[PDB]
From a paper:
F1 domain of ATP synthase is a rotary ATPase complex in which rotation of central γ-subunit proceeds in 120° steps against a surrounding α3β3 fueled by ATP hydrolysis. Upon dissociation from the Fo domain, the F1 domain can catalyze the reverse reaction, i.e. hydrolysis of ATP driven by rotation of the central γ subunit inside the cylinder comprising α3β3. The catalytic sites are located at interface between the α and β subunit in each catalytic dimer. Here we describe catalytic intermediates of the F1 domain in FoF1 synthase from Bacillus PS3 sp. during ATP mediated rotation captured using cryo-EM.
Two 120° structures were classified according to structural differences in αTβT. One 120° structure, termed step-waiting, has a more closed αTβT than the second, termed 120°. αTβT in 120° is almost identical to that of the 101° structure. The difference in αTβT between 120° and step-waiting is the result of movement of the CT domain of the αT subunit. Thus, sequential structural changes occur; a structural change from 101° to the 120° associated with the 19° rotation of the γ subunit, followed by closing of αTβT which occurs between 120° and step-waiting. At high [ATP], the F1 domain of 120° and step-waiting were composed of the αDβDHO with ADP and Pi bound, αTβT with ATP, and αEβE with ATP. Step-waiting comprises αEβE with ATP, αTβT with ATP, and αDβDHO with ADP and Pi.
Residue numbers in the entry:
A (entry chain D): 232 to 352
B (entry chain F): 232 to 471
C (entry chain E): 1 to 470
D (entry chain B): 128 to 377
E (entry chain A): 24 to 501
F (entry chain G): 230 to 284
Amino acid sequence: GLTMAEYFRDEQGQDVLLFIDNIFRFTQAGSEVSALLGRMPSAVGYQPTLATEMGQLQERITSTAKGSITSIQAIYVPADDYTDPAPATTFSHLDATTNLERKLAEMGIYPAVDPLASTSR
Amino acid sequence: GLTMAEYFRDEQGQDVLLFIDNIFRFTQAGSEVSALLGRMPSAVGYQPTLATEMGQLQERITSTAKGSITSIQAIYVPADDYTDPAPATTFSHLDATTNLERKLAEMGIYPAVDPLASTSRALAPEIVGEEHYQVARKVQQTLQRYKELQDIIAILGMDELSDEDKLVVHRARRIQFFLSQNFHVAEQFTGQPGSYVPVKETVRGFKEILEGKYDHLPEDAFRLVGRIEEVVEKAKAMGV
Amino acid sequence: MTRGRVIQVMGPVVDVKFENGHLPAIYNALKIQHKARNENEVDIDLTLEVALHLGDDTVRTIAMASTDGLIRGMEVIDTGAPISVPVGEVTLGRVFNVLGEPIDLEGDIPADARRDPIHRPAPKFEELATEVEILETGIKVVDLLAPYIKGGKIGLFGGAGVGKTVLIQELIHNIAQEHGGISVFAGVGERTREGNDLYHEMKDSGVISKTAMVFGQMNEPPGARMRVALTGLTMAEYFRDEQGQDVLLFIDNIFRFTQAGSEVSALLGRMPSAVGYQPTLATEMGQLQERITSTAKGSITSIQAIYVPADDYTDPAPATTFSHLDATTNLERKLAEMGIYPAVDPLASTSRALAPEIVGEEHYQVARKVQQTLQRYKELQDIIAILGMDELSDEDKLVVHRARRIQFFLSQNFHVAEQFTGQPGSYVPVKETVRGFKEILEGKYDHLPEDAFRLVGRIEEVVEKAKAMG
Amino acid sequence: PIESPAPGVMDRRSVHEPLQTGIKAIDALVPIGRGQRELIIGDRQTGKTSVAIDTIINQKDQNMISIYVAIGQKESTVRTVVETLRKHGALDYTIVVTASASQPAPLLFLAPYAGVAMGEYFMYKGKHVLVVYDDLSKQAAAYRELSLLLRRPPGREAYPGDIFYLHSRLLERAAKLSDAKGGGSLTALPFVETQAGDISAYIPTNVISITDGQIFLQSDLFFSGVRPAINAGLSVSRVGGAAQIKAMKK
Amino acid sequence: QVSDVGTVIQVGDGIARAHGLDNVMSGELVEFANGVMGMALNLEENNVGIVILGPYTGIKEGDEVRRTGRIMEVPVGEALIGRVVNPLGQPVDGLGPVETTETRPIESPAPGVMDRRSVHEPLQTGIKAIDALVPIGRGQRELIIGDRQTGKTSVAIDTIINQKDQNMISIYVAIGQKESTVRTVVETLRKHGALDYTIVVTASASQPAPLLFLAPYAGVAMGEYFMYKGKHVLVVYDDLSKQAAAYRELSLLLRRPPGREAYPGDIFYLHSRLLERAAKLSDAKGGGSLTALPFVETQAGDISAYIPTNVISITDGQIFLQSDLFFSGVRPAINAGLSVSRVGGAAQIKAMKKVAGTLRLDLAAYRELEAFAQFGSDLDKATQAKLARGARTVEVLKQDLHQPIPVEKQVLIIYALTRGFLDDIPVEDVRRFEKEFYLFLDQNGQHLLEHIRTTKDLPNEDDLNKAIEAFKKTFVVS
Amino acid sequence: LDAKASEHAARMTAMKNATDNANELIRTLTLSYNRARQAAITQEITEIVAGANAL
Ligand SMILES: Nc1ncnc2c1ncn2[C@@H]1O[C@H](COP(=O)(O)OP(=O)(O)OP(=O)(O)O)[C@@H](O)[C@H]1O
Ligand SMILES: Nc1ncnc2c1ncn2[C@@H]1O[C@H](COP(=O)(O)OP(=O)(O)OP(=O)(O)O)[C@@H](O)[C@H]1O
Ligand SMILES: Nc1ncnc2c1ncn2[C@@H]1O[C@H](COP(=O)(O)OP(=O)(O)OP(=O)(O)O)[C@@H](O)[C@H]1O
Ligand SMILES: [Mg+2]
Ligand SMILES: [Mg+2]
Ligand SMILES: [Mg+2]
């Protein structure tokens, strides 16, 4: 998907939006591939190359002279644990963060964005 | 032992009592010998074939159309961790289980059977009757509420509970003490002779305790007795 | 022959191949001394320590420095003995590294001096003294509530800026003055600037003339960080083995020794233990601590600071270390800011020697009464914070009256503290301080003002100070 | 031999002879009989060695051999223990086996077996023996060291799989022999050191699962003046009643 | 011959094995066929393990490896000033090659115990809270620790900018950040004029793990040149946590056993080697010095984590930034209660030391009495002094972005705060009062400013008081 | 009025004691949790080491 998106700025100077369904599943797939290849597990069983893979994916989403790619990515948080490596390692690449709360969702307030936890530079 | 019991079940059609002193040692020895057989370690150090080896042994201990075998097995729990794989995988192979607790053992309330974690498939209204089932469920509910109240009691004091919760605690302590019993084989440890209590007597006594008839008796009068009457004589001996 | 060559280099681990029938023994020292033949080489002067015999005339060794620049096939020569360091009077006042090479600028020790092996079996069961004896430090609180034992191990705990270094200097001064002994400091795996500051402090105090120092600090490789403790320990052993003295041995951090051992085991490839430590943790702790003992002609007592990871005393390294300690002293920042020096927390500090069979019935009774009075005052302070002083009974008033004077009398003037207090120090005998505390408990000095007990030596100096004040 | 089979089912007899240790807190509610095995478990500096030495000293006026095995102790501590035994007169019938912390792991692993083998001679000659193991926990640590040096896979808490077998093989050999075997007996008092009073740890549970009862000494009670520090809730004797005289049992 | 050449027999995850290279040295640099550099790490019996310092996707089995004959080293010299460069000394901003003529090895011994001297020279960061509560001396290693988006980078950039007229050389090491973020930092430095004395070392997240692992060592090697030439150097490490993550990646790829909490057993040695090379040299070794500001990121302020504990044990102090304070509008977010510098305080100037004591007491008292503000009462014990002076202190300790101020002006304003001259001014007007007071000083107090700048001590108290009163006459409350 | 003042003082002291007790429980439970989870972490490390060795 990133390769398909990069063309519209590299050859046409467009401003393009790239939407990613879930980064957590990407990290899970990377960990599974590492386990299949037989590398020693990382902190909680992830791949040792988690940070490098995250950097390789995210660093190509940048703005240049010809155009720019802005990305909206959904991140799944297992069991509310924000300390988990998959949510944790992606924080360093985000300019703005949005937090959704099931407590707000059950009250009928959509989009249920937490107004005190959301931050932006 | 199972080979002998199987013959007694099959070739003669007789009822068999099978007692296994500790079935955990079988899997423990299997895990000890696994490493020298070239198997890779699994879970916390157990053999990969833990489930299949246990199943091959457990599935032979069953009642058939030509003979019934009732078996009582004691299962050791390493490091008091009920989530250990050996205790965990053997739960599915049992129809009735009783869980003992070191916390209850320390309190002196033997046999220290956990009243909540212990389960059985015979506890149904059509098997034991509504009179028994309602009493059992009410006892479990009261004990669960008393367990929940511990934190608020500790961090707020007893006087801050509502009159409903005060009564709940008052009944639950007496129920927990009455759950204890004096065993015949325990006479070598303590001088009390022991007793045998019928199911009707147990149900009637617990129903009477739940009804509030014995709220005026002291707490310790319910410890290590038989029928509900012995509580009354023990209280009279203490001087009520 | 006694010459070999390098076949494998993997970080600090070096494998050396020797001729058949001429392998070096375990713990032996091997020297690599190479000059660059051409522009693509560098000069190398490195020492190795034999660890394992891998078979096929191959030996696995660990280096005491960086192995960068090594080339497969360089010649290695065996010294035929373990690491040897100089011992004797020449070591006093100097600073050494793990290899025994002087770090200071005073010059190198001549090659004709006596040197002793680093590795040595522990003293035998026959040689040990059959009696437990108290080491009279001359500090009132230590001699009263946490007595030290000759040949014993003492753990030193406290926050930063409370006075651990000052207490160490005072202990060295008192021992070298009254008992005629010396001290050795080995700062294992700590700050180089801290070591420099300690060196300058000893030079200022004049204590440096009676002590020897080995550092091997954080920047050093794990092998050096592990063997610094042993080289300091053998420098300490010499004096009591030959001259029969009583020697102080200071280790700045014993936890770094175990950490370096774990790192070395990981390099060697041994399977990690429970929490990633080496399987030989308890064994190595044994060969280290079992050489610090009292014998029929001398004794070595050690003051050790122990780091507790994550404040968990159940961690394997603190658990193994605590099995050897005989006493514990805790520096207290609240007392330090209150103005009591030394601020050594009379309630928290404990000692195994505090028993009637070892220290005496009168001493034990006095210590227990003082501890009970201090605990009672600690309880009473909470009621003071609630109701005020006047509501307490006259018995509680008397208890506070005695406790304040006892707590003030626990303070003492150190010899080293003169440099920023003006007043000279004092050495207080254990019998003298016991008699003084007994007299204070008897109420014989209640009429004196409490400030006369602020900072003083013997009990007679208290009444002299009160008389001079008014 | 170091490795010897334990007495069988038919070679044993029920314990019926009290072993008076001279301590009320033991003789009253945690009785010890001849042929029983009873561990003393607690934190460091709690009085386990004092209890063992007092039990050994109390046997002066009875015909029984005592064996004290020190595993992982300081040489100075062993020297002081020997000096106290000599002062009180226990060395006339006591054998001391020592393996200090500076000794290699194999000797630490081997010492308790040497002690029990020494006791076997007197037990099978028809005499009564008391054996004390000073740190089965340190024995387990040494065995773990050896196993990981042999690259055997580690289990719970990095201990080898046969850590239970190691202790059971040793402790099972103490027994009360029958009249056909000569009526001898061997009493064992193993020691286990806990961390922060945690009785749920792997090694404490393993050793408790083998013996005939435990004496739990609590640090919180050792402080604040209750020096024996007996914890009645966690302590138990599985040969109670039979191991007491009729009066004390009554 | 196969002594100076070799052939790759294994490639994977940035690690390669080569056959040959008989004369290669341990820790040497090697050259691949396509120009990618590598390090000879393991000299096994019949093969050499190589860590690839670049894109390994272009390397196949069977290509040639060329020996270079040099232990790993980085270019050094004054020619690096004003340029952004990778850990290997290759420029990344274009602008032509860097024409230096000197090199220095990456792995070098730290200064000896006899080569060091006690820290005695102040380091002016331009931040009120840092210069007041946690003074930093030249040669000290001070840790900056906090959660995400707490202003650690802003503090570092302000400190670097404040060195404009100080005779200090700054080195900024970016480890694992976004390349765009590094670009923005460079742009701000260029705008404020700090590139005249600053070297920037960058290693983006897309780079291989060895480059991230080596970047701070390259920064130290660059700094040591100026340190041993007699100059003063400042080095900033932006993610020691990301360095640790990269080193754990490399160690796991090398199949070394994990240690405590999945980190390698020598993760403490890794940081100790790096942070131990900053020191104050004795007069025999010259007057040079190097000071370091490592950065560590916590999870929800959990100081007790493994890496924060290791760095705290290594360094001489810490500065803690709190997310709650940052969100509450206190942008400096420095927690004076937990922050401490232990080598510092002796290097602080006399004039500032004379007021820091009162400032600490006032701020601390406010910091235990803020929670009672639900109902102000008890008269002077709470209201007139603790609630008022503390609120005014919090107001004056705030500072705008990229606006460092001189230490003399800091001394003036903090003296005015402590002596009660701000008791009548309402809280909303305190910042405007300070801003106008700075201009009034620049217009009328040249004598006081020169006296402080030349004597490092407070001027005459009567003159200072009359100047403050003269300014307060002209101020209007609004 | 005096009874009202006494009531307010009693509620003050009761709530202060309740907060102290709750904070003590918080400290104990946090210590227990921190001591508990490190054992699981070390068990995971041990499993990784054993798996690597067995191959
Ligand atoms: N006996 C004493 N009498 C008076 N003041 C003392 C005494 N001991 C220490 N101090 C004061 O306390 C300060 C701390 O001393 P010192 O440096 O020895 O402490 P420390 O606990 O070893 O420190 P750190 O852990 O920071 O190295 C001294 O500089 C001195 O001002
Ligand atoms: N009944 C008692 N009365 C008084 N003191 C006692 C008693 N029992 C033990 N002690 C004292 O308690 C201390 C510790 O006792 P002991 O050495 O037997 O403990 P331990 O658990 O074996 O110790 P360690 O772990 O150091 O080997 C000693 O000073 C001893 O004198
Ligand atoms: N004193 C200040 N005044 C105003 N804005 C500030 C101040 N300090 C920081 N900020 C802003 O707050 C945000 C924090 O970003 P900054 O990079 O400084 O934080 P950080 O803790 O290093 O975080 P990161 O992990 O994102 O690198 C930025 O938008 C910065 O401009
Ligand atoms: Mg110090
Ligand atoms: Mg003992
Ligand atoms: Mg940043």
